[PDB]
Design a protein around this nucleic acid. Structure first.
Ligand SMILES: Nc1ccn([C@H]2C[C@H](O)[C@@H](COP(=O)(O)C(F)(F)P(=O)(O)OP(=O)(O)O)O2)c(=O)n1
Ligand SMILES: [Mn+2]
Ligand SMILES: [Mn+2]
Ligand SMILES: [Mn+2]
Ligand SMILES: [Mn+2]
Ligand SMILES: [Mn+2]
Ligand SMILES: [Mn+2]
Ligand SMILES: [Mn+2]
Ligand code: NA
Ligand code: NA
Length: 315
DNA sequence: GTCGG
DNA sequence: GCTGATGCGA
DNA sequence: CCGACGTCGCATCAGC
């Protein structure tokens, strides 16, 4: 909260660059600045004090000066009051509608929720589901329900095969008081690098009516919707993602999947330096051959990082 | 947009 | 009908 | 000054 004004404004600029300008790297830049500034222990008194930090350059420094002087930002008010831009930004809030479809809808007059309803015919399945649950998906999931979902998912998985192991990862694993969704890392002895496991887990979860809709399904990833059962006399629908990972790659998998997204980018970068390439599966030398992983701490050892706990990788 | 080369 | 590239998201 | 900037899985539809 300490520097929320700045970071909120950077995050908003980041989103504009992604959704409207379709400039992914500028998106990345603002998010980096925002991340660095959120890790800064002091209260930012000037743009130049900000500019000392890596990721914060000339332009952002100016935008910080204006923000601390005016309380607002000229560039954003423009964006906010601009019909197209404000419209594109709103539409991308629908799961399945990104910068390109949003802009295409808008160019053809489809610019509000109603318009999407008026035009269901023009939405793919995933978009239709994002529409259907637009409200629910924007809600947070308080840890107490996360644990309630955790319990139901491990249980149903056991029921399929006692040798499954499911680790809920994502912000839950970082110990967050609320998460955006449920991310589930799944492994099984039958399946390794050398070696329908996912379909069976999904099918079972569909049968007890936990999973209610499918966004995408493959041999290793399921993206769908779920919902805790309530008193017979309704919980909001939630996004759940299940990843099937080869057992001997669990620790890389769970590193990736625990995040944060920025942690992962800061790690893969700060390992790209040291001659490693970290993906959700392996860690290779600069390239290359998959080194022995045996713990998460194992990955950190390699790239020379003081092992950070999950609750500390939220950047 | 930022920064190392 | 098929499929790469484009899109969207983890 | 310029251009590189993490790394993946699944679905969709143009252009044939
Ligand atoms: N661009 C990305 C996005 C995600 N992830 C990895 C790292 C993430 O930990 C993991 C899940 O991403 P998520 O889409 O469920 C998330 F990010 F929103 P989460 O971290 O879980 O916070 P919450 O969902 O509660 O809002 O995928 C990544 O490596 N790169
Ligand atoms: Mn200091
Ligand atoms: Mn998540
Ligand atoms: Mn997720
Ligand atoms: Mn060991
Ligand atoms: Mn294809
Ligand atoms: Mn340039
Ligand atoms: Mn056609
Ligand atoms: Na979207
Ligand atoms: Na420089």
């Amino acid at each position: 909260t300490l520097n929320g004004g700045i970071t909120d404004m950077l995050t908003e600029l980041a989103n504009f660059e992604k959704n409207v300008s379709q400039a992914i790297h500028k998106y990345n830049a603002y998010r980096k600045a925002a991340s660095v500034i959120a890790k800064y222990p002091h209260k930012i008194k000037s743009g130049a004090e900000a500019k000392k930090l890596p990721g914060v350059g000339t332009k952002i420094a100016e935008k910080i000066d204006e923000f601390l002087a005016t309380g607002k930002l000229r560039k954003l008010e423009k964006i906010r009051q601009d019909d197209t831009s404000s419209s594109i930004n709103f539409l991308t809030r629908v799961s399945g509608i990104g910068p390109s479809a949003a802009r295409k809808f808008v160019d053809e007059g489809i610019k509000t929720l109603e318009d999407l309803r008026k035009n269901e015919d023009k939405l793919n399945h995933h978009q239709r589901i994002g529409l259907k649950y637009f409200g629910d998906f924007e809600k947070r999931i308080p840890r107490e329900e996360m644990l309630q979902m955790q319990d139901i998912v491990l249980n149903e998985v056991k029921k399929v095969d006692s040798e499954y192991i499911a680790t809920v990862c994502g912000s839950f694993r970082r110990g967050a008081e609320s998460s955006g969704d449920m991310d589930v890392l799944l492994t099984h002895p039958s399946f390794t690098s050398e070696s329908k496991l996912l379909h069976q887990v999904v099918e079972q979860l569909q049968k007890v009516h936990f999973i209610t809709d499918t966004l995408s399904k493959g041999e290793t990833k399921f993206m769908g919707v779920c919902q805790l059962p309530s008193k017979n006399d309704e919980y909001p629908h939630r996004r759940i993602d299940i990843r099937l990972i080869p057992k001997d790659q669990y620790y890389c998998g769970v590193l990736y999947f625990t995040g944060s997204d920025i942690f992962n980018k800061n790690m893969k970068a700060h390992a790209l330096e040291k001659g490693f390439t970290i993906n959700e599966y392996t860690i290779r030398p600069l390239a290359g051959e998959p080194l022995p992983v045996d713990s998460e701490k194992d990955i950190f050892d390699y790239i020379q990082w003081k092992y950070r706990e999950p609750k500390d990788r939220s950047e």
